[PDB]
Amino acid sequence: ATKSVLQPPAAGSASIVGGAGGTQLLPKNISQEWWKKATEQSIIPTLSKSTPV
Amino acid sequence: ATKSVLQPPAAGSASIVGGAGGTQLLPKNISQEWWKKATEQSIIPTLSKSTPV
């Protein structure tokens, strides 16, 4: 049979990583760029009279 | 007995190309400008954020 790497294996094929634990061999690419919201600005220091404290 | 060129020949007339296979001598004037629609633009590569994959 021809060797598959995707999971589950394609029909009539064999999985290259088909050995026990072999899927731990499949690569990962982790993005350097996150999904994170911006946080809310503080308005009070802008929207008030500054004083010595 | 007067000699036509349009097909089929007019009534009471002889075709000028009435010999066997003679219509293969009539000119065509095929246009270089096609009739074809444009197809729809793909938008996903324009809209999406690019990433390594």
Cα separation of the two ends of chain B = 78
Q: Which DSSP state fits A23?
A: G
Give the whole-angstrom CA distance, residue B8 versus residue B30: 21
Specify the resolution in Å: 2.6
In angstroms, the separation between the Cα of residue B50 and the nearest Cα of chain A is 11
Contact across the interface for A31 and B52, Cβ inside 8 Å? yes
Which residue's entry shows tokens 């197809």?
B39
Which residue's entry shows tokens 């802008």?
A46
Chain A hits for B53, CB-CB cut-off 8 Å, are 29
Name every residue in A having a CB less than 8 A away from some CB of B: 29, 31, 33
| Solving technique | cryo-EM
In angstroms, the separation between the Cα of residue A29 and the nearest Cα of chain B is 7
The alpha carbon dihedral of A4, A10, A14, A18 has a sign of: positive
Give the whole-angstrom CA distance, residue B22 versus residue B43: 54
